[PDB]
Amino acid sequence: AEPEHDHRKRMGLKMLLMMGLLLPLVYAMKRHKWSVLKSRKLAYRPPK
Amino acid sequence: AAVPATSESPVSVLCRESLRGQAAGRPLVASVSLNVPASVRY
Amino acid sequence: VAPTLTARLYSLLFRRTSTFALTIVVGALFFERAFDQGADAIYEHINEGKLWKHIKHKYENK
Amino acid sequence: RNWVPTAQLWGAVGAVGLVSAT
Amino acid sequence: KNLLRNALVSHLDGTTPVCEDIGRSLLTYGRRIPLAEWESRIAEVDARVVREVCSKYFYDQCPAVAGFGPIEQLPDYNRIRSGMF
Amino acid sequence: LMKIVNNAFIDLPAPSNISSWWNFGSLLGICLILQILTGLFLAMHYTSDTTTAFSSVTHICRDVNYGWIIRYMHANGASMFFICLYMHVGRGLYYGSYTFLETWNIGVILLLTVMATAFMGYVLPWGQMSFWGATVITNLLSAIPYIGTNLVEWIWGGFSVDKATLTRFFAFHFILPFIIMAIAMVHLLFLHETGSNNPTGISSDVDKIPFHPYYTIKDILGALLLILALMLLVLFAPDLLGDPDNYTPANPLNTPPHIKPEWYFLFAYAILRSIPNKLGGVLALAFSILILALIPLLHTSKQRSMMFRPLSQCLFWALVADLLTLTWIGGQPVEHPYITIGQLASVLYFLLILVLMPTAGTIENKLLKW
Amino acid sequence: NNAFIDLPAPSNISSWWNFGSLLGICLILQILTGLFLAMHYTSDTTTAFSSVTHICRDVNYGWIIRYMHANGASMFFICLYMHVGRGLYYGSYTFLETWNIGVILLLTVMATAFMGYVLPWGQMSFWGATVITNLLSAIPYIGTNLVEWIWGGFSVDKATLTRFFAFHFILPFIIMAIAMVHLLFLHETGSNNPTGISSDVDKIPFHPYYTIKDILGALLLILALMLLVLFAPDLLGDPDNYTPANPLNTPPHIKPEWYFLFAYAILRSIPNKLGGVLALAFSILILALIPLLHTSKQRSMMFRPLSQCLFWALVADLLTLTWIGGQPVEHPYITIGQLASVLYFLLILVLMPTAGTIENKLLKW
Amino acid sequence: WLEGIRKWYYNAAGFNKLGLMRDDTIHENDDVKEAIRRLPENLYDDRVFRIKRALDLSMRQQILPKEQWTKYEEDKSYLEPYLKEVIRERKEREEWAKK
C-alpha cells in the first residue's frame, strides 16, 4: 500500500536536520536586520 | 573651480555681536561661476 | 597583531562578491556530500538489519 | 577593467554550477 | 588630481591662509609640508590607488547618517548599509 | 521592468508593528504556487476517464519518479491552504481588517473559489469519497426552485455522476487556480491603495518601514515554517488529514456508512446537517460563508481592532471554540447527544456574529464614554 | 478607460492594423472552444482518438466546436502572418520591446498549435510529435537526453500524450498574459501608421472610430472562419489525421500543417541534420534581427519603391516555399526549394538593407 | 458599579499601557480624518508622538512601566469638540440634500 514508506522517512530525517539548521540561521538573519528597529530610541522635542 | 564657496545656496540673527558686520559699506558686486557658488558682495 | 577566524573568513571569502559566491558553490557541493553520507548513515543505523542493503548478501549471486 | 576579473569569476560560477547542478 | 592641485595652490593665496596653514600644520603634521611634497603625493595617485583607497574606507563599511527636516523619504539604515556594496 | 516590482514590493511602505498573523497572506501566495506547481506535474500523468482515473493516480504514486512526494505534497498542500485561509480570515475579523471593503469582499470570493477548487480536485482520483462528494455537493444546486434539478444534470452532463462529470471537473480544477491567482492579484491591488492594517487598529502612517528587508526576511522565515509543517505531514503522516475511504475506487451502488467530508468542510457540514429541511440546510450552509460579507456592516465599536476590547476578545475566542465544536460534531454520527450539541453550536455561531459581537461593541463604547 | 476608450490613435491607420484585435479574438475563440472540447477529451492513448470522434458524433454541437477550434487555429496563423507582414512593411519593429515580445508570441503560438495537433492522436499527430521534439536532438552532447526527457520515454507514447494535453491547456493562458504585456509596451508609444511619420498632430480617440472598425473586422473574420467551418471544414486539414496513430508506419506523403510548410521547406533543403535545424530556428529568430538591419532614413516602406519590390519578393518567396513544402523531395522541387531558402535569408540579410542605403543615396541623405 | 467597572474596563482595554489616550485609538473614518486635520499644532504633534510611541512598543511586544500608563482619571477627549462639529456640518449638508 505504501512502497514509498522507507524513502519518505529517510527524506523526513534529512528534512528535520536541514530545518534544525536553516530555521535558526534564517531567524538569526531576521533578528540581525530587525535589530536596527528593535533597539531604536525615540525622543519628542516640541517647541515650547 | 576646485574650491566650493563659503556658503552653498538653495531656495538668522538674534544678537548684536552676530549683527555687527551686516551693514553694507560698499557698492554691490555680483559673481557667477562655472564651478563655484554665485555671490553678491555688499 | 593576529586576526580571528571570522575576520579571516571575511577578508578572503566574503568581502569580494565573486569570492562570496565561489565559496557558496564549493561549500554547497562539500556540504551535500557530507550531509547525505552522514544522514544516510544515521538512517541505516537506526534501521540496522532491516534494509534490503543489509540482508541482500544472503540472496545475492546474480 | 575590473570586469575581466569579475567576468572571470562569473564565468567560473556558471561553469561550476552547470557541472555540479547538472 | 588637477582639481586638487588647483585647490591647494589657490587656497594658499594671501597672508592669512598661509599663516593658518603654518600654525595648523605644525600642530597636525609636526611640520609644514611644502607644495612640492604635496605635488609628489598627488602625482603618485592613479586609478589603481583611488580604487584601493576608496574600497578600504567606503566598501562594505557602516556609515554614520544624520538627517534633519522633511525626511520621511530618507532611506532606512539597512537599505543605506546595503548601498555600501 | 523595475517599477511595480519596484514600488509594489521593495519600497512598499508597511506598518512597523505587524505581527506573525500578517504572514498568512504571503503563506497563501506560497500555498497557491505550490498547488499550481505540484498540480501541473500531476496533470502530466493523470487521465480523467473513469476507467483509468484511479489507476493513473496509483501509477503516479508507484511508478512515476517521485510521483508519491508530488502527490502527497498536493494533497497535504490543500490542507495547509485551508489552515492558512482560516488563520488569515481570523486575523481579519479580530483586527478589523474587513473595513478595507474591497480587499475583504474579494477575499470572500477567494475563499469560495478555493473551496470549489479543492472540492473538484478531490473528485479527480475517483475513489469513494470522490464520487459521493461529487454527488452531494453538486446536488446542493437542486435546492434551487424550478430549475435546480436541471442545473444539476447540466453540470453532471447526465442523470448521474459519471464519465462526463469527471472529465469536465478535471478541466474546471485545472483552470480555476489560475483564475484564483488573477483574483488574488486584484486582492493585493486594492490592499495597496490603503496599505496594511496593524494589531492596534490605529493608522501607521507615522511609522512605516520599507517592506524590504524587514518583511521580505520575515516572510521567508514564515515560508520555512510553512514548509516544515507541510513536510512533516508529507514525510511522516501523509494520510493523517485524509480519508481511508478514498483508497477504495468509486462504487455508484454504495455510499460508505461513515462517510464524512474533508476536515476543512466539517464545520459547514455540521451546520447543514443540523437543519432537518433541505432548502433550510442549504441556505444555512451558504449563509455560514456569505455572512463574512456582512461583518463590515455589523461593526459597532469606535475602535478598529479587538486589541483594546476585552469583551469582544472573549466573544471572538468563543466563536473559534464554537467552530472547533462544529468541526468535532461534523465528524460524529447523527445521533444523540451530538444532534443537539450541533444545533446549539450552529445557532451559537450565527448568534455571536449577528448579535453578541455587535452588542459587545456598543457596550464597550459606553464604558469608554463615546 | 485610458487603455481603451480615450486611447489616442492615429487618424490614418488602415485595415492592416485590424489584425492585432483579430489576433485577440482568435485567442479568445481558441480558449473558449478549447475549454469546451477539454470537457469531453481524454488524453490516454487508448481513448484520445475515440474521445475526439465522440465529440464530433455525440456531444451536442460537438462537431461545430471542434471544427471551429481546428479552423480557428488556421485563422490564427493567417492573422499572425498578416500582422508580422504589416510590421515589417511599415517599420513597426522599431518599437523594439513590443516587437521582440511579438516574436516570443509567434514561437509560443507555434509551439501551442503543434501540441494541440498531437492531441487527437491520428497519424499526423504522432509523427509530428516525433519529428518536432526530435529537433532538440540536434543539440550536441545532451540533445537526445532532452528528447527522451520531453517524451517521458524512449519514444512518443502515453506519457507524451498526457503531458502534451497539460502543456497545450496552459500555454494559451500564458500567451494571453504575454499579449497583455505586448500591448502595454505598445501603449507607451501608441501606434505607428502607414506613413511611418509621427501622428501626434492628428490623433483621434480609439472609441468610437476604431471600436466600430474593429467590430467590422471581427465580422469579416467570423465570416471567413464560418465559411470554412460550415462549407469546407477539412479543406485546410490533412486526411491522414483521420487515421489513428500507427507507430510502425509513417505515411508516404506526410506533410506539415500548411502554416508550417515554409519552415519545413527550408529545413528540408539542407542535407545535414544540424544545419537544417539551425536554418529552421534562424528562419524565425531572424525576425529579432530586423531592427538591427534597418538602414533607411525613413520608418515605413510606403515611400520606398525599391524596398517595396523586395518586400513582395519575400512574400512571393514564402509562397514558393509553402508550395515546395507540399511537394515530394524530387527534381526539380529540391533545387527550387534550395534557391527559395537561400533567397529568403538573402532578401532579409542583404538585399533589403542594401535597398535601404541606395534609397537614402537617391534622396541625398 | 458602572463607574467602578469603568475604571476596571479602562485598564483591561489597556491602551493606557502603551501610553495612548482614548481618542488616539478611534477608528479613522472621513469625519475623524477631518477632525484630526482641524487640530491645532500642539494637539496634532502630541497625538502623532503618542501613536508613534505606541506603535514602537507594539512592534517590540512591550508596554510602558506602570507609572507611565495613561491614567483613567487624567484621560480627556481632546478630539471631541472637533469631531462633534465635523459631524454636525455633515448632518447639516445631508439634511439640505433632501430637497
Ligand code: HEM
Ligand atoms: C487565495 C487567498 C488569498 C490570498 C492569496 C490572500 C493574500 C493576501 C496578502 C498577500 C495580503 C497582505 C499580507 C497580509 O496581511 O496577510 C492580504 C491581506 C488581506 N487579506 Fe487576503 N488573501 C487571501 C484570502 C483572503 C480571504 C479569504 C479574506 C477574507 C474574507 C482575505 C482578507 C484580507 C484582508 C482584509 C487583508 C488586509 C489585512 C490587513 O492589512 O490587516 N484574504 N491577503
Ligand code: HEM
Ligand atoms: C487552489 C489550488 C489547488 C487546490 C486547492 C487543489 C486541490 C486538490 C485536492 C484537494 C485534490 C485531491 C488530492 C488527493 O488525491 O487526495 C487535488 C487533486 C488534483 N489536482 Fe489539484 N488543486 C489545486 C491546483 C491544481 C492545479 C493548478 C492543477 C493542475 C494544472 C491541479 C491538478 C490536480 C490533479 C491532477 C489532481 C489529481 C491527482 C491527485 O489526486 O493528486 N490541481 N487537487
Ligand code: HEM
Ligand atoms: C498572440 C499574438 C499576438 C497578439 C494577440 C497581438 C496583438 C497586437 C495588438 C492588439 C496590436 C495593436 C493593433 C495593431 O496595430 O495590430 C499589436 C501591435 C503590434 N504587434 Fe502584435 N500581437 C501578437 C503577435 C505579434 C507578432 C508575432 C509580432 C511580430 C513579430 C507583433 C508585433 C507588433 C508590433 C510591432 C505592433 C505595433 C504595430 C504598429 O503600431 O504599427 N505582434 N499587436
Ligand code: HEM
Ligand atoms: C493559442 C490557442 C490555441 C491554439 C492555437 C490551439 C490549437 C489546436 C490545434 C491545431 C489542435 C488540433 C485540432 C484538430 O485538428 O483536431 C487542437 C486540439 C485541441 N485543443 Fe487547442 N488550441 C488553442 C487553445 C486551446 C485551449 C485553451 C484548450 C483547452 C483548455 C485547447 C484544447 C484542445 C483540445 C482538448 C483539443 C483536442 C480535440 C481536437 O483535436 O479538437 N486548445 N488545438
Ligand SMILES: C/C=C(C)/C=C/C=C/[C@H](OC)[C@@H](C)[C@@H](OC)[C@@H](C)CCc1oc2c(O)c(OC)cc(OC)c2c(=O)c1C
Ligand atoms: C461545478 C462546480 C460546483 C458544483 C461547485 C460547487 C461548490 C460548492 C461549495 O464551494 C463553494 C462547497 C464545496 C462548500 O459549500 C460552501 C463546502 C463547504 C460544502 C461542504 C460539504 O462537503 C461535503 C463533502 O466534501 C463530502 O465528501 C465526501 C460529503 C458531504 O455530505 C455527505 C458534504 C456536505 O454535506 C457538505 C455540506
Ligand SMILES: C/C=C(C)/C=C/C=C/[C@H](OC)[C@@H](C)[C@@H](OC)[C@@H](C)CCc1oc2c(O)c(OC)cc(OC)c2c(=O)c1C
Ligand atoms: C514540449 C514542446 C515542444 C517540444 C515544442 C517544440 C516547438 C517547436 C517549434 O515551435 C516553436 C516548431 C513547432 C516550429 O519550428 C520553429 C515549426 C515551424 C516546425 C515545423 C515542422 O513541422 C512538421 C510537422 O508539423 C509535421 O506534422 C506531421 C511533420 C514534419 O516533418 C515530417 C514537420 C517538420 O519537419 C517541421 C520542420
